[model samples]
Target: MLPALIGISGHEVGAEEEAAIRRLQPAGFILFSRNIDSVEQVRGLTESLRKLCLHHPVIAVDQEGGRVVRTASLGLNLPSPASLARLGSVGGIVELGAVTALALRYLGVNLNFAPVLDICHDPSAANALPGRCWGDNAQDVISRGGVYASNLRRGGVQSCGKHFPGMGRALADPHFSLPVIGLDERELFKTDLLPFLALCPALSSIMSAHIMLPQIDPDYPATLSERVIRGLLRDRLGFRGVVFTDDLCMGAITTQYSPDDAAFLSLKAGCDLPLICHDPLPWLDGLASRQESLNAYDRWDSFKRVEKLSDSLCFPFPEKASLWDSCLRRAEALCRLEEDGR
Candidate 1:
């Protein structure tokens, strides 16, 4: 059975790493830049990781492109989110999605943690999510993100929209500091939270941000809040997919809760998979140390449901990786606005 919370890339699993993973049996795998060198290397790495798992593990990566890309510097040229949003035809988005999915499949990845849907209307907050927010407008976000998600589905790769309930309002990097969203509950529902509500049905997973929504839940951030996950997402938006935490190593989260407690609380809050991507030792300790807490029925129930969904979403294996590069180029070209508005 899949563990309630999962950790990724546990400190570069060396020669004897396979045994460690099999013993712990994390619910899934997520790739990082350090895990790739070439197409064959990535495929081999994925295969090696999958061998220890019970089912088709939820293999994921930060393939969002631009500064946030994981695979580009190695073998592929990942396009920017701004470019994809600029070239906003639904058909174009779908084509790009399929190609990206095929590329992920080629590398043995079944999940692409991408298609950021935050609406960045304020200029200052732009620094927090630049090149990430699809556009300044919410409608454009919905249209483009929906198309992108649909395309990923068509290509047999499950899609996850990230920094949920809007990270656009967050001003600083949560990796270094905490981000506070001062908006009240109603204001959040009207603006920053709207896109999530509109797109939740289309998403297979959602990545939580580290920011605190004081109006909804003052005590905890979205990743560990029952109100946000259970009240807003599950009750309001009707999203029943896996709820993945951003990263436990981030200062905002670690500064407050112990990694072990964070993992346990996240599952208790209705999140299926709590992501501890960086600092694997702490995550490993966290998982091992909190066995009693995670074994509780509510948390384990959500975790099992998540694993079942992950099992059901295995791709049919793509044939080629380069079939979508042309569309990425097209999106890049479309993003280039002529000097005088040609």
Candidate 2:
């Protein structure tokens, strides 16, 4: 059960990773650009990991279009979310979903950390989410982001609406330090919260941000805030789906809290998955120490969610080469649209 809540590793999984996977039995594995040398390599890696684990682990990737496209090496360079939005329709997003699903499914990836629901109010700001966000306002975000998520699910890949309830207005990147959103609860619910609330029913998972919302929870960031995760997301938003914390290895978490504290606080706050991307040794060591006493109910709940996610895995299709080429054509054309808009 302890293994069903943590996500770890990059591309290269060798003897050490294999031993850790066998022993700890982590819940999921995330793939990055470093991991994708070729299509066959990734598929073999995921398949081997699944065979080793007790249960079929959730193999995931940050295959978001544009700048965050991890599978670009495989010839699937999707247009950025901002470019999709510039098309003045959700058609581009829908196409992205279909093509992205084909790419991930072919590569043996069942989960995609995509369809950034954050509203990028100022594209020129030094924000981490430059072309990642779909729209600049809540209404625009809700309409476009919702379509993107739905179509992504339709294409056979589970979608995760990220940085909830919103991180669009954040001036600083959480990768460097904790960015605090000063807006009050009412103002937030009216703006940044709109896309998340709208996409809750359709999303298979929702990723918590590292940013702090002082109006809701002054002490901890969203990843470690019960007021945000349990009270706002679970109770108020009625999101029964999985809740994942963004990489706990990020500066927003590592600098302020120890690995042990981060794991306990995030789970206690209602996150079903706590991801430790770069170095998971600290988190694994810490969780191992308290594994026996971890809440049984929480463990069971997370395991059940993983089980459900496994059931939703999309079957691979034939003629993948043709489909992949078609997607690349469509994606490049959409990218051209962005240039036309400028």
Candidate 3:
């Protein structure tokens, strides 16, 4: 089986995609807007995926609320990161996290790649992360994002803190192009890393940013950088959970390296999961023959981390038939919440 996460084409699994999934046997699957229709369709899709995999594969989504909530495809109007931050109540954010986890769990999803822990340097930057940060300062991020990770995890659905050590200062969008950040070690730790360090103990995974930090690794972005992923994230910070590469198919990666090459590089860089959110067949085929070459570099412990996390997934909490409607109203009400005299 490939140490990867992948995506399919449509709401339902197509024949070609199904065959590829069977052959590759990815570690997990990420749902996007294209793969979502109604709640019933999403629930069935996940159940079918579990049946397809030899192991219980993780089913995740970018349900970070705001501009992402792929469930928005289902017409669910969820809150944004900025909107969530405005609640200004720890309990408020925690309740939202709990309700969100229930909604995802009820839909058969196990992981929510959220709690954008990056320190917001500029809310106006078109860095492919508009209005998706918790706070403008490190402490703000730590307060909102730390509780976000803890409460989201407490709700049974796992959470992943993203783009470490932080790409908030990057000038370009990593989705369409490489973002180059010039921050040095001192500045990086002082600002961007505070939230990650604060929430490290609570995260199940950390998705590496595709930004190029020349001061750290001039040759590659964080996804393909051994020093960044292995030396810094794993060794220095002592993050024991799975390390995920932010989509090998993103333009930032594909522009310099093919999907297979990026996956191999990320694996070598100590990342446990390389996400291929598009066609994964050619990449899997190209890497199948090279798996043996990575015997020395492959991390069995981290794969076990994936296994343990997958097995530990909280079964969806028992709820009434109309629970979704109630949660939806709560979420809608939360979106409309404003600070008031208490």
Candidate 4:
């Protein structure tokens, strides 16, 4: 059996990819900007993948808006999380969530990895999450991120709260290098982890950060640390939902361990999904040989969640034009107000 998660290229799926997907049957696939050409094309691709799986497979995207938006070219120019918060209420955040849900649902995408809960105290820092964060304080991040998650669920998309326990303290990019978090347990639980602690109970999924927490475990990063993923997240904090890793192709991971080793270690550490974003062939082949024990309960849990979304009530595609226009207008207005004060 194949692992429960996989990533696909942005281009058209060829026979080789199709054959692998059909044979392995990953529980989900994450989409990138490269996978998106147009709305119709995206919709057809999602439909095709689901048909191949012969089940309601989860289709996810990193459509967090601002610099990370994948579908902006399709006219869903959503403002960043910070911009939504500057609108001065959870109302805009909720509306953005609904708009995101409606838009993704129309395209047959079910999961959204969004609402960066990382509390970026220093926005100008090299690795600081400026536009992606809701606010500098944990309370605002909790409030805004909670509203967005609730609204996305209402809009028929399962939302994943991400980068646990948090990545806000990092000064280096995990995409380029492993950023070690220096905070002790007391300090970490006070700031960086507040949003994740508050939101984990309600979120359907969470993506683990690749940052190393010497305070938690001296040997591995959060993605491969049982002390962080299983001991802290599951045992202490009480998160029972699916847990995913950041892309294994990232330098933080690849520089330390092979994809196979990272994937196995991540799963063993309690991450149900190890996202092999760029090159999956080696990882896939490796898992097949090593006889990775697929988690039946976790697979079933994810499947049920996906099935619920597929059955959930979604607004029709025809309504997208007006929804996009309204969302875009709100974003523009808020952006201007933000610039006015600056």
**lDDT of each prediction vs. the true structure?**
0.70, 0.76, 0.78, 0.74
Best-first order by TM-score: 3, 2, 4, 1
Candidate 4 local Cα displacement, residue 84, angstroms: 2.4
Q: Which regions in candidate 1 have their CA more than 4 angstroms from the true location?
A: 1-12, 88-90, 171-177, 315-342
The alpha-carbon deviation from the true structure for residue 110 of candidate 1, after best TM-score superposition, in angstroms, is 0.4
Runs of candidate 2 with Cα error greater than 4 angstroms are: 3-12, 171-177, 315-320, 327-329, 336-342
lDDT rank order: 3, 2, 4, 1
TM-score of 4: 0.86
- Tens digits of per-residue lDDT for model 1, 1-342: 435334445324564446557777777877788777776677777776677777777888877766776765454654556665665545546655766776777677888887787787865655633577677877787887888888887777888888787877765534434677878767777777787778876788888887777778878888889998889878887777788888776675787887768877877777887776664554565566665555477766686667666775664354454544543554344334311122
Clashing pairs in 2: none
Q: Please, what are the lDDT tens digits per residue for candidate 2 over residues 1-342?
A: 354344435555777777878888787788888778777677777777778777667778888877798876766677788777877756677777877887787777888997788888875756554688888898888888788788778878899989887877665545435887878777877888777887777788998888877778878898899898889888887888888888877674788887666877788787877877776765686776665566788767766776787777664555356765666677677667666766
Candidate 4: misplaced stretches above 4 Å? 127-129, 172-177, 291-342
True-vs-predicted CA distance for residue 294, candidate 2, Å: 3.3
**Model 3 C-alpha lDDT per residue in residues 62-167, reported as the tens digit of each score:** 9887777887755566666666676666767786688788788887889899888877776566546466888888899888887877878887889999878786
The superposed Cα distance between candidate 2 and the true structure at residue 300, in angstroms, equals: 3.1
TM-score of each: 0.86, 0.90, 0.92, 0.86
Model 4, span 87-204: residue lDDT tens: 6756667777887887787777888998788887775655433488888888888988998898888887887888787877865534435887778877877888888788874577
Higher TM-score: candidate 2 or 3?
3
| Residue 230, model 4: Cα distance from true site in angstroms | 0.9
lDDT, candidate 2, equals 0.76
